[PDB]
Design a protein around this ligand. Structure first.
Ligand SMILES: CCCCCCCC/C=C\CCCCCCCC(=O)O
Ligand SMILES: CCCCCCCC/C=C\CCCCCCCC(=O)O
Ligand SMILES: CCCCCCCC/C=C\CCCCCCCC(=O)O
Ligand SMILES: CCCCCCCC/C=C\CCCCCCCC(=O)O
Ligand SMILES: CCCCCCCC/C=C\CCCCCCCC(=O)O
Ligand SMILES: CCCCCCCC/C=C\CCCCCCCC(=O)O
Ligand SMILES: CCCCCCCC/C=C\CCCCCCCC(=O)O
Ligand SMILES: COc1cccc(C#Cc2cccc(C)n2)c1
Length: 410
């Protein structure tokens, strides 16, 4: 009994149990809130079944402390190993597929704007110079600024990764273009006259504005005061009429028409231009961890060696599932970082990225702390729980807050 130990002067067992009980309550609160209000936008477009997997994992995480603070029964040693390896995998494997889909969606948006400008501006697959004499390739991608061709080729090879010999492919031109777009967005967001229109626009219409920026620069685009305002206020037809009066339209009519039409429809009509799969993959990434665990069960059978349950788990019995989860966390972080600025679903991505930043630190810190500790069971309890609380706190608590306290927003 954990109360005994507190009485005997050791408050660690009861503290761990309380942490886990509170963890279970909160996860229970959050889950029920998601069951009732699954009928709402803020939950529908986000993957519901995947969310449940993540919550289940967090739940099992907290449950792990009851496996570590236990009566001496054989099965608890089995449970410990199962729970400690499998519960992070459940959460992180469902999450990686979530961040992956968010990464594909984003990539295909970058592909569209690339095609837009391939059509409007064109690209060269071989090195050339701009009107200012600087070495350039693709859709106006600046390579270097020195007057030496070989310096451009080296810098290109550095950028692409193979020995290009001054010649690249279309996919590689896209690669370079993605950078230039990124930088282009930075500038718009650093421009007071342009930030509010860009923030308010949907994805397609954002590309149209970026298109204009590429043609005239920011200072030129900011000169369409009235039109930008109309766009910001969503008066699409009026913006179209207004922009068709400009000198821009009159100097480059063929291109301006496509851009204006894009602004007017929010579609790509002027340019030629699976949830179930997620569950199967998440299922697979989880079974792999189970495979590792079951294999270590056969190589190194669990055995007991009071309130603390000392099992005979070797360093390998810990490290192998730990390593695998570490890989999942790594993949999550990678994809989450990539999609960190994605505005969709009330900036859901910003929370997911922050969560993984924290997880990485917590897990990296766990290695020296745990393997240099003489209080391993309690270190494990707090660690699993902290990791589960970080996920629950940083990702689900804000969603619940929006649900219950902003019913006029969602
Ligand atoms: C909300 C508050 C509920 C959270 C925790 C209260 C339960 C703590 C249970 C510990 C008792 C264990 C024992 O019997 O030794
Ligand atoms: C929430 C904190 C609850 C902690 C309860 C400690 C239990 C002590 C006891 O039962 O004697
Ligand atoms: C405490 C409970 C924590 C997690 C339980 C996860 C299972 C929830 C899925 C519910 C299925 C459904 O009704 O759609
Ligand atoms: C109310 C909450 C109660 C939690 C009780 C669990 C405490 C005992 C579990 C671990 C043990 O057997 O020592
Ligand atoms: C549910 C988890 C059950 C784990 C199985 C443990 C069985 C051990 C044994 O067969 O000796
Ligand atoms: C929860 C279920 C997870 C695992 C149950 C499977 C454990 C069986 C592995 C065999 C152990 C052994 O060979 O001794
Ligand atoms: C952000 C990275 C994700 C988390 C890192 C995962 C940590 C697990 C991976 C490897 C840990 C290093 C191997 C264990 C050290 C053995 C210590 C010992 O037994 O002496
Ligand atoms: C950092 O120290 C450790 C060591 C080993 C395992 C863990 C863990 C975990 C876990 C469980 C369920 C849900 C989530 C998000 N995480 C933490």
């Amino acid at each position: 009994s954990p109360v005994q130990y507190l009485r005997w002067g050791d408050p660690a067992p009861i503290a761990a149990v309380v942490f886990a009980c509170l963890g279970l309550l909160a996860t229970l609160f959050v889950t029920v809130v998601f069951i009732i209000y699954r009928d709402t936008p803020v939950v529908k477009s986000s993957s519901r079944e995947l969310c449940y997997i993540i919550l289940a994992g967090i739940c099992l995480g907290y449950l792990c402390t009851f496996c570590l603070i236990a009566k001496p029964k054989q099965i608890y040693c089995y449970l410990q190993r199962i729970g400690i390896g499998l519960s992070p995998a459940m959460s992180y494997s469902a999450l990686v597929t979530k961040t992956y889909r968010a990464a594909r969606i984003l990539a295909m948006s970058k592909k569209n704007i690339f095609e837009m400008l391939r059509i409007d501006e064109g690209l060269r697959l071989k090195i050339y110079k701009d009107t200012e004499g600087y070495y350039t390739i693709g859709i106006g991608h600046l390579l270097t600024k020195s007057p030496s061709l070989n310096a451009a080729k080296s810098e290109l090879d550095k950028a692409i990764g193979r020995n290009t010999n001054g010649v690249i492919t279309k996919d590689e031109a896209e690669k370079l273009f993605n950078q230039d777009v990124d930088a282009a967005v930075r500038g718009i967001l650093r421009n007071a006259k342009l930030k509010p229109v860009y923030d308010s626009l949907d994805a397609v219409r954002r590309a149209a504005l970026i298109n204009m920026v590429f043609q005239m620069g920011e200072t030129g685009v900011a000169g369409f005061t009235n039109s930008l305002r109309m766009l910001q206020q969503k008066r699409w037809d009026e913006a179209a009429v207004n922009l068709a009066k400009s000198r821009w339209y009159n100097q480059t009519p063929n291109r301006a028409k496509r851009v204006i039409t894009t602004f007017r429809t929010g579609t790509w009509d002027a340019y030629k231009i699976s949830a179930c799969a997620q569950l199967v993959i998440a299922f697979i990434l989880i079974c792999i961890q189970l495979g590792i665990i079951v294999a270590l069960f056969i190589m190194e059978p669990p055995d007991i060696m009071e309130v603390y349950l000392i099992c005979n788990t070797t360093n390998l019995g810990v490290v192998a599932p730990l390593g695998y989860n570490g890989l999942l966390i790594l993949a999550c972080t990678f994809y989450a970082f990539k999609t960190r600025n994605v505005p969709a679903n009330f900036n859901e991505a910003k929370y997911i990225a922050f969560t993984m930043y924290t997880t990485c630190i917590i897990w990296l810190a766990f290695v020296p702390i745990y393997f240099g500790s003489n209080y391993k069971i309690i270190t494990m309890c707090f660690s699993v729980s902290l990791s589960a609380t970080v996920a629950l706190g940083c990702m689900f608590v804000p969603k619940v807050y929006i649900i219950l306290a902003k019913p006029e927003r969602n």
